[PDB]
Subunit: 170 residues, 10 copies
């Protein structure tokens, strides 16, 4: 029922005026066809959707923001969800995020408390968890879904966690 | 009754002599029409207002101030509310705010106390909560509402929290 | 009775030889007219005053001093109250104030004690509270009141708190 | 009886070879005239003195010394009291004072102990309290009183506290 | 049954547009032939696989990331598994990793806690453990298996732990 | 009996080869004339001395030494007492003194212990107390007394405490 | 039986493209000849081996890695064992090692705990213990054994412990 | 009996090849003449000595050594005692001394323990106490006594304590 | 029996390609001649050896390694023992040693624990004790013994302890 | 019996190729002549020695080593004792010593523990105590004794303690 589609199974088109674009097509199988699930293999996969039924989208997005040159330590992530005339926007939000700068270093105290592994320290300290739930609605009649992630203040390096994805709930 | 209109559903017009402008039109539906609410999708939406009745506005504004070049660590935010001759000002106030500078960094002690996540540290330390309540009154006869946020001392980067908005109380 | 007139309802005329000037006119309504109060909306408003009666002024002035270029950490604020020939001075005083410099930064210890919010630290540490009470007397016959705030040693940035104002007591 | 005359009611004439000069005239009202007091409004006021009677002067002088360019952290204040041929000196003294330098900054420990407000820290740490009592005698026959405050080692910024003044005792 | 094939028994082809490539051929012995194991000697060895049976691959990958010139302290490792027209991708994933920079040094406290040996400190602090399990499926009909490890943000030095390898489960 | 003559009632003649010179004349009133005392007003006053009787001088000298340019932190003060041919020396001594340098600053710990006021810290830490007692003898027949204070190693700023003076004992 | 051959009894040929080479010839004495042992004198000695019997090699390698110029604090040691056409490789492995940099210094705490002698601190902290056991097999028919130790990332100084050697087990 | 002759009552002749010279003549009064004492006034005084009797000299020498330019923190003081052909040396010794350098400053801890007064800290920390006792013998037949104090390594500033002198014991 | 020959009784020939050379001749006295001992006076002495008997050498070598310019904090000492065609090597070994660098300084804690004397701290912390025992054998037929001490990585200053020497056991 | 001859009673001849030379002649008084002692006055004195009897010399040598320019913190002192053809060496030894450098400064902790006086800190921390006992033998037939102290690594400043000397035991 709750088909989770990871973002690595989307088509990625990086740009400079719109940030990162996650677009993917939609396949509409008819009723009584045993809805399949999206294989979590990081391969471009068409999203299975019931033929005529409204689907509600839950966006789970974990990412690491890292500064390129400007080294500003706070930024605003812009999320824009589109759908298949031209594409019409159905959702837009902004989320303040923390971005790694070259002047940031772990204190020895942070190693002792947050975990000896330094990946754990970034997971508990710098990971940006963004969850848009019960806000996006999409129907299978539309044949395209697009997600835009753009940094507002400065152009930066975004490291999207592999488990980030959109949950297509019943 | 208490229709909350988030600021991301307003039309944004950034400038250099007036700061950021949040203008939006007003729709006047007649009585007995089941007042709708503003969908929190970040899309430009006309504000629903009762046909002939005085509305009181409560401005909730959470934002992150961040210095561009001047790096001054304190600023004065200027809030100016207009309405639809030319637009007439109905409210004006100033609020001192704290702005992130490139010379500011978290101490290890702040990580331990305010929260391991560094977004929590900014939320509890640098977030500017500004609440103008029971001070602004607007009637549905006027067909425009405008909010101006301008920094006085220096031109800066303002990161408005997504939950910031104006509450149109009964 | 105790009509509080905030300074943002005054007319502001910034200069370079006299500092900031807060001038505003006076309206003299006759007796038995239900003395109104000044609306705290930050809009230029004539001060209501009883037709023939001596009023005593209490100046409440909270402000943030911040250094522009000189970066001197102490200054002398000069307060001069005038009234409506030319304007005649009726009160003058000086108050030492603390001014933010670019070499000043919060210690981690100050965050823990004075409050996690950094605006609280400035409120409890750098805010200059100046209260002139029972020293200024003005009658409604005069049709102008002017307040001058000037820094003596150096030209600086003054951030006047929005609640600063003059209380016109019975 | 103990008429306190604040120094801001004197005439101030700043110079470069003599420092700051506080000169003011004297009015001699006759006996049985209900000796008035000096209004603490910071306005130039003639000092009321009994017609024929010796008055003893108590000089209360609180000030903030602040270095201009030399940044020396200790200085010698020279106090010279004159009276109304030319003016004849009747008192002279020197008082070592502490002067703020641009290399001085508060430790976090001083904030916790001496008071969260940084004006309190300067009041308890850098304020120079100078009290000359029972040393100066002046009669109302002389029609002028002059006080000179000059820094000896270097030319500096003196911030005289508003409550500083001369007490004309019975 | 669970034949573990270390990555040092693969053929290594370092590049600049695709990172490090681990390609190796597959030998298909028939049934009833006493499946041999891969000798852990770091020598190029053909992978033994049952003639007609689906094998599931478990990728165990421990590595040390170290910055060359860019000195960025966080990176995204890209894993792409291919198989033997041209090679078709069957799996792709990204894993955030921590990379040693020349500005990083051990604190004395880390020596006391994580172990006196400094290799233990890197093992418990900087070693990137990446385990893809129950996600990759490969059949012996295909005669080639390829693994690509590429750093996304910057070109870096990857030190693959000798025990890293792919487990060919029953 | 013990007439204390403060040094500010002497005539001061600063030089460069002899340091600071404190010279003053002597008045010899006859017996049975009610020996007066020296008024502590900082005005040049002739020293009252009994007509024919040996007087013993006690030199009390408190001063603040402060470095001009050389910034050496220790110096040798040279005291030479003369009397009224040419003047004949009757006493000479040297006293090591501590001199303020521009590289000296108070620690926060010194504020807590020696006193919150920073003038108290200099009084208890840098004030040079020099007391020559029962060593100098002068008779009223001689009509001049001269005291020379000169720094030996370097030319410096001496801040003589106002209470410093010579006690003319019975 | 377990003849231990220290590496200092090998022939050393340092290079730049292959690192350090430890090559030595093999003498094949016949059966019933009282197998001698290798004298631990650091002199080039032929390895005694039984005439026709498979020998298993256990490599014990303790070394100190020290950075020359690059100062990177982690490296990958490459071990390649050859034997006597051209030489054929029979074993290859990689071992991450810790390398001394010029920015590394002992904390006083490490002296107290790991031992007062500073050679003990390096022995317990920086010594790289590498033991390849039960992985290398060599027969006496081959007349040459070669061991290559090469640093992968950077060219460094390797200080091989004198007790390092290869154990030729029964 | 134990006539103490302070060094300031000697004739001082500073040089560059021999350091500081303390020479003074000797007066030989006959027996039964009530041996006088040397007045401690810092004036050149002939040393009283019994006509025909061997005197033993005890040299008490307290001094402050301070570096001029070389800033070396240790020196060797050379003491040479002569007497009245040419002068013949009767005693010579060397004493290591500590010399103030411009890189030396008091720690806050030294203020708390050794005394709040900074002259006490130098008295207990940098004062060089040199006492040659029961080593020098001089007879009144010789009419001259000379003491040479010279620094060996470098030319420095010596601040001889006023109580330093030679004790002429019975 | 156990004749200890200190290394200072050897002939020292410092070089640049071989390090320090300790060569000395051998005298062969016949049996029944009361074997003398080597006088520990630091003078070149022929080593007494029994005419025809194998002697076993025990090398005791304590030294201080100190960096000249390279300042590397770890080195490898190379010991080569020769004997009297050309000289034939009979022993060779390498010993890792710790070398003083100009960036190394004692902590105050090391003074308290390892001993107040700073020579004790070097004795317990930086002294390299090297003891080769029961490994070197030399017969009196050979008329020369040579010991070479050379630093491998860098040319350094070796301070050989005076008690270092070779023990010629029975 | 145990005549102690301080080194300051020797003739000193400083050089550059041999260091400091302490040479002095020997006087041979016959038996039954009441052996005198060497007066500790720092004057060149012939050493008294019994006419025909072997004397054993005990060298007591305390000195302060201080770096001139090289600033190396460890050195090797070379002691060579000669006697009166040319002079023949009878003893030679080397002693590692600690030398003051311009980068060395006392910690506040060392003042508290080793003694408030800073000369005590050097006495307990930097003083080099060298005692050669029961190693040197000299007979009165030889008419000259010479002691050479030379620093090996670098030319330095040696401050020999005044109590250093040679004890001529019975």
């Amino acid at each position: 029922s709750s088909n989770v589609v990871p973002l690595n199974t989307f088509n990625i088109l990086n740009g400079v005026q719109f940030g990162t674009k996650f677009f993917q097509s939609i396949k509409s199988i008819p009723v009584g066809t045993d809805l399949p699930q999206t294989i979590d293999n990081g391969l471009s996969q068409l999203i299975p959707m019931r033929d005529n039924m409204e689907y509600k989208l839950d966006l789970n997005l974990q990412l690491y923001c890292q500064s390129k040159t400007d080294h500003l330590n706070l930024d605003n992530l812009l999320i824009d969800v589109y759908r298949g005339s031209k594409d019409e926007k159905i959702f837009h939000t902004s989320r303040p995020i923390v971005c790694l700068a070259l002047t940031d270093s772990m204190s020895p105290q942070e190693i002792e408390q947050l975990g000896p592994s330094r990946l754990d320290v970034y997971d508990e300290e710098w990971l940006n968890t963004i969850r848009i739930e019960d806000k996006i609605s999409l129907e299978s009649s539309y044949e395209t879904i697009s997600v835009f992630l753009k940094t507002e203040i400065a152009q930066r390096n975004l490291i999207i966690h592999p488990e980030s994805g959109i949950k297509f709930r019943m």
